[PDB]
Amino acid sequence: PVAESRCYTQIKVVKFSYMWTINNFSFCREEMGEVIKSSTFSSGANDKLKWCLRVNPKGLDEESKDYLSLYLLLVSCPKSEVRAKFKFSILNAKGEETKAMESQRAYRFVQGKDWGFKKFIRRDFLLDEANGLLPDDKLTLFCEVSVVQDSVNISGQNTMNMVKVPECRLADELGGLWENSRFTDCCLCVAGQEFQAHKAILAARSPVFSAMFEHEMEESKKNRVEINDVEPEVFKEMMCFIYTGKAPNLDKMADDLLAAADKYALERLKVMCEDALCSNLSVENAAEILILADLHSADQLKTQAVDFINYHASDVLETSGWKSMVVSHPHLVAEAYRSLASAQCPF
Amino acid sequence: GPVAESRCYTQIKVVKFSYMWTINNFSFCREEMGEVIKSSTFSSGANDKLKWCLRVNPKGLDEESKDYLSLYLLLVSCPKSEVRAKFKFSILNAKGEETKAMESQRAYRFVQGKDWGFKKFIRRDFLLDEANGLLPDDKLTLFCEVSVVQDSVNISGQNTMNMVKVPECRLADELGGLWENSRFTDCCLCVAGQEFQAHKAILAARSPVFSAMFEHEMEESKKNRVEINDVEPEVFKEMMCFIYTGKAPNLDKMADDLLAAADKYALERLKVMCEDALCSNLSVENAAEILILADLHSADQLKTQAVDFINYHASDVLETSGWKSMVVSHPHLVAEAYRSLASAQCPFL
Amino acid sequence: GPVAESRCYTQIKVVKFSYMWTINNFSFCREEMGEVIKSSTFSSGANDKLKWCLRVNPKGLDEESKDYLSLYLLLVSCPKSEVRAKFKFSILNAKGEETKAMESQRAYRFVQGKDWGFKKFIRRDFLLDEANGLLPDDKLTLFCEVSVVQDSVNISGQNTMNMVKVPECRLADELGGLWENSRFTDCCLCVAGQEFQAHKAILAARSPVFSAMFEHEMEESKKNRVEINDVEPEVFKEMMCFIYTGKAPNLDKMADDLLAAADKYALERLKVMCEDALCSNLSVENAAEILILADLHSADQLKTQAVDFINYHASDVLETSGWKSMVVSHPHLVAEAYRSLASAQCPF
Amino acid sequence: PVAESRCYTQIKVVKFSYMWTINNFSFCREEMGEVIKSSTFSSGANDKLKWCLRVNPKGLDEESKDYLSLYLLLVSCPKSEVRAKFKFSILNAKGEETKAMESQRAYRFVQGKDWGFKKFIRRDFLLDEANGLLPDDKLTLFCEVSVVQDSVNISGQNTMNMVKVPECRLADELGGLWENSRFTDCCLCVAGQEFQAHKAILAARSPVFSAMFEHEMEESKKNRVEINDVEPEVFKEMMCFIYTGKAPNLDKMADDLLAAADKYALERLKVMCEDALCSNLSVENAAEILILADLHSADQLKTQAVDFINYHASDVLETSGWKSMVVSHPHLVAEAYRSLASAQCPFL
Questions:
Q1: What are the φ and ψ backbone dihedral angles of A144, each rounded to 5 degrees?
Q2: Chain B: nearest CA to D242, how far in angstroms?
């Protein structure tokens, strides 16, 4: 009783790395094996499985108290397996890998599975500034992922897929249109600052701009109009989202970006900024996040903030901002009270 | 040594089902080796887009199974990911009882196009004996059992710091909707009587040639009523479909004329799409046709691929009518192909 | 003779998986006899509206589970189908190995809201014992393995009929399109100044009221023109919605006067489920208002159940002000409630 | 090991039945286990579970060669389990029960699986007219099914609320609308025979009448509309459907109604007409069904018709009508070749 297939197997390797630097690693103070994760990032080609770097600044359990446990975790996937190989390396002060550690073999993976070699590095050893492993007191991690697919004959019909179309693009040319401005069809005024933008892209992409230009303004004041809502720095990023569908400079000014998106009803940018603020939940902000969410109907981030406050209530409620929020906005905490009413029902 | 703790409990999902596929009139299933005939494709129901089929041969392959029956399975579909599964094969007797029930040892690695089955499953002559009660009126009744293991994962107990459901890109879809709705059209395009309506900036960005015409201080006569005769209406419609969506579902059946239209406006992305679509149509007779289409349109990649195809299939390409037509019509192509095959593939030794 | 075969091989459907539940600070998760505390929901992943939640007793039930920790499995959600399944509990040691695992003799019966398990699943003292090491940092570890069996058959197939596919009755949604696009309507109705304009034949067919008041001598005079003098417009809308569709999506928040108009306009199907929906809103305080509203308007079944529930809750119904109100205004109604009570309390 | 559930048990049953008629039982000649079948039957309300019966006029296997096998076959369900109990009976010429048999218990059920009673009644004894079981050689059998529902505590608030709500009488009201012609405005003629109808109902159902009446030529057309292709009884049943959505006697007059549906773009009408034709399949009718379907864009019916033709080419290609339709309509047989070549043949 033996089974075989008699087929040529071509092994694929979709390599992709990630850079992570922890701001002020020394004051992490993550005792009891409490963990810090990286910013969400995708796997490059075929953006459907997304990886993420997970670090415990102090290694769990008594054995790795001095050590810094390091693991790599997969954010989400469509209920399948991955057979990747990982290489953990630490860059020096000048940016050269020192603590390289390549996986001896491919590891079986599933959604949320963590893998890594415990006792990766001693924290006191890392803290030595003379070694250059903490430039400006920042802990830099660099990881190299190589996902193995194990395709049999790559479905050979020859049609081997020699050559290819270039990578699918459009947004890059729209970015060139943005920066050059290419004599667009309308003008914008923003707090005195001048911006030059198109009409058809605004109308098709945004219902708000779809209705706002074409209703009596196409000849009256189609060329010129003033927006007293958005500062020019983030207005540039919002217009960049209109052009290329992305906002690389989104994290820093994300609250006013949320305001601008909600006023114009940019739902996709609304979800991106919801994910951005989802990564910035603490004791000293969650009440203001609730104000922003109800001000914008950010239902996903609203529920996430509700759950986070439910989890960390015993010290989140000790903030002055919470007091100002509840006295100013009791209805929001009444909604949270209704949400927790079902939670505390059982038992 | 190098060890990596899992730090996730090995909870496992296992899913066992079964299915039978009978064969009426099995005794009259012809008689020669290599008769690969498969079962009707079947599915669990909770399959999650997965299908399977058997591979029954009246005479087994290789040497030992000359007088046996070879039974093998296949994975019809998968979501471009590996599958770990099991298979058990058995035969129901006259009283519907499993007789040749031998199980597998461990769940094997399964992908689309791969097959795993017990070689030398059962003797042909022994099954041909009616005393075993296994051939009722030439109705051979198979039966198989699948047990797909997954090694499932959750933080089920308890709590989950969740992500927000990100939406997918809508730029391609929204521009396509603007195209088909044809709202805010700044230019009207006419081809062979049919009149379409399109937009200025997208056409200028994705087609430098259209930007070249419409930037020449002449728009009110041309941009509002531009007329083109080179491109037929259906190719031209698919060309705007490419520009406004980057998606051409029926690109292969209209590849050469669309390539010519792309060459007219230097739509190099759609040009390489047409090159790739043509290149998955390789045959000995149309090599000259694709070569001249590339040479007229300067499709360097497809021209090189067609020349390599001619180099590989010269023995029949020389006798083909297309090669003779190319030779009498275009000796330059003959010279270029000869130079291409000259300093490669034979100069040894 | 008496027999019942299948003519098909007994193939069996099975879905085996497992689930764990973490519990913090077990030493301070309260302790008294028969404590009902449950877990968060969970399922395999291919659930098909199928969910379960654990149910654990820090101190068990009855008598012989005081010093024990019993455990049960409640079926939370299901597709209203009889669920037959096996289950297997376990406890993991400190070294990561299941220890106290026992599996059901057969696939127990499960339906929505049914609990099953093994009473006396573990001694509380033994679990609390430090030598076993089953409670590190006052954290109690669960691990359950479960399989669900259905016993269906998958045949080779000759495709059978192969064409059971058919659109359901989409009819009278077209009448919805007639209404909320007005699709050449032919008569004109005024409610409270607000205007709505419809087809004569529809309301003629639907109820005797609109039919009769148009069928005789009004077609000559006011065939198109007509107005109503008792119905509220915002509910007038949903009233036509049911009259067209035989379906009212939003009814409970306006069901009282809707039902009153329905009896005023003879809509028996509307009448009955609006009464039941108000009866689904049964409470101690509403019952007087519901009773007077009901029996003022021929509400037979609702009269019966309103009377019965008021009999069942007479004690706290007494101090309701509405009780004395209807007693003062409509005494014969509560007299007939007594008449109901006559045969009610014959024994015992 | 043993466990409880701590609950009440409320059982609810709604039983139902349906006549079966088999004319000329002697001449059926359904041997070697040729199962006789008809359309699936339901319980009336809540048609989501469609039941059916499977009968062998000659019982298979050596035991029941002379006997007749009578077995239920549930067609489809939402992947659930049901515990219905069933009884059967065969009436006499007068319609009186003599050959009655019942079930021992509440048998389980799933999609496709069959319970019943083999080895019951003789074929020769049934065929003996001295017994009087076959009036004019007509086998008229009766089947009843009692669906035992069962549940746990019915969510034991006591939650009773059992309003005896009737069903949606909208079609029945439209049944009276067609039958009585109350409030009629528009009339029709066909071959001199005249039967009138209503305007907005036809506007609702059809896109075709919507086309040829919305054009503002109503008084000339809609007052005295005429149709050419349809026939009187055919128009009767097509009016019956377009008013009702039901046409239980469509089987004997199905083809004509399919043609009428093609004349009026009545997609649901065409659907169950094609379904009735799917219960018209024979080894010799496939040419006629092909002519009908291919003339009418009947993609699904031509699909399974071609599947039948592929499966029974061994006689289909050997019929005279096959040659006739090839001569008249060859190209459709060309796609028949295209299908059967790429079907149950790409092996190997």
A1: -125, 115
A2: 35
